[PDB]
Amino acid sequence: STGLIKHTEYMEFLKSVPTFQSLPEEILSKLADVLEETHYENGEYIIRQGARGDTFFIISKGTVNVTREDSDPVFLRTLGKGDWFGEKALQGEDVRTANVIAAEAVTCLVIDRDSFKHLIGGL
Numbered sequence: 001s002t003g004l005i006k007h008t009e010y011m012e013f014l015k016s017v018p019t020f021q022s023l024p025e026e027i028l029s030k031l032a033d034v035l036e037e038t039h040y041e042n043g044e045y046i047i048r049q050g051a052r053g054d055t056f057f058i059i060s061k062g063t064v065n066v067t068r069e070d071s072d073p074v075f076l077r078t079l080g081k082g083d084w085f086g087e088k089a090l091q092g093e094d095v096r097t098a099n100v101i102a103a104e105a106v107t108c109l110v111i112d113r114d115s116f117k118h119l120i121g122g123l
């Protein structure tokens, strides 16, 4: 099935990221069952500084720029394949502290707070 082919792709990708390769096979499989892909185009804002957030993003394709207004926005850093962002939104109500903008065609694997709490809660 197409769901199985996507699950196999996500498993291979997670096993290529050292931080996630430390997880047991059982947990990676359950995480790959719930992750979904979101695609972004060059210049598209993935996250905005000051917005409320509920999603965590792992980059599976492309690069993003992280920027913020200190009072025009300043450049903070570029992230790419295997990096992630937005994790504070998984721990509870969160206000984003920086923009994350696609710097080319991007794909992220995403999970929201409700799905993350359900996954962790079942362990």
Ligand SMILES: O=C(O)c1ccc(CN2CCC[C@H](O[C@H](CO)c3cc(Cl)cc(Cl)c3)[C@@H]2c2ccccc2)c([N+](=O)[O-])c1
Pocket (backbone or CB within 6 Å): 019, 020, 023, 031, 056, 084, 087, 090, 111
């Ligand atoms: O300094 C420290 O205290 C510190 C603490 C933690 C980490 C690792 N941690 C960093 C944030 C992303 C991810 O965690 C989120 C939950 O926040 C997460 C999202 C999904 Cl989908 C699924 C799982 Cl299991 C977890 C990752 C991680 C945490 C645990 C397992 C695997 C990956 C790091 N670090 O390596 O940077 C530094």
